Amino acid sequence: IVGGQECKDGECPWQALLINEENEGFCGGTILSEFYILTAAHCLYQAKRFKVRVGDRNTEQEEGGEAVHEVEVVIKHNRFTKETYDFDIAVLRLKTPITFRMNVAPACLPERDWAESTLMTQKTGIVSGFGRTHEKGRQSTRLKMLEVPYVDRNSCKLSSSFIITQNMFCAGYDTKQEDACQGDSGGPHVTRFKDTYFVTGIVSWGEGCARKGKYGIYTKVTAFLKWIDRSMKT
């Protein structure tokens, strides 16, 4: 995350981190329930074996709420394609259930019509992660969050060198130096409504980070609500 703020105690409890064999984060996720994590399909080709860590805000100290979970089943969307990042979504079932506590809780799944008419028409959403704090920098040891404006669909298509499918949406700023970045992929994009936070997107891709005339591209979660429901039953 470039710009933004630290997630303070209890502020981002749905954040998950995919960690490799060296215990290093390489992608984010969103806690959906005690057994399921939402992430990006493209993240599944960036490590041989991985686990999921929750309840962490500082990777350099033990805070008391951290928990590592092994993955039982990987459920990647069968129409995902590396060429365009269309259908960039996957769900993970964990071997053991997440025990909710301070800094560990799920984000809510909204209904499609209401989320598209009411949540995606709000001024901003919130993106979070342990990714780079600038395009060529190192990964953050602190979990960060950032308010990102929803961007007009036509404006986004005009700004982009690459295709924006029906399964994607844009958020962020034209020139202001705030955006998601490398390592934030697969993480949460949530929208606040009457003090309740609903999942609205998955960090997907961008032409660099916080570049002038470019926005952040997110997987459109609302187009995948039926798919998510099915994946969470088997």
Partner: protein, 53 residues
């Protein structure tokens, strides 16, 4: 602006229109209150809430 377009139809969470009237509902893990508008958490650590303890 009428029904659901008018301040979310007074609903805490989901709003839908049926036969010229507002129907409110809630996310999984919440139950609709007696007034048919507010959403009440069924158990500890409900979805979408920042944690306080």
């Amino acid at each position: 602006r009428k029904l659901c377009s008018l301040d979310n139809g007074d609903c805490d969470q989901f709003c839908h229109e049926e036969q010229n009237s507002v129907v409110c509902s809630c996310a999984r893990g919440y139950t609709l209150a007696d007034n048919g508008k507010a959403c009440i958490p069924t158990g500890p650590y409900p979805c979408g809430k920042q944690t306080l303890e």
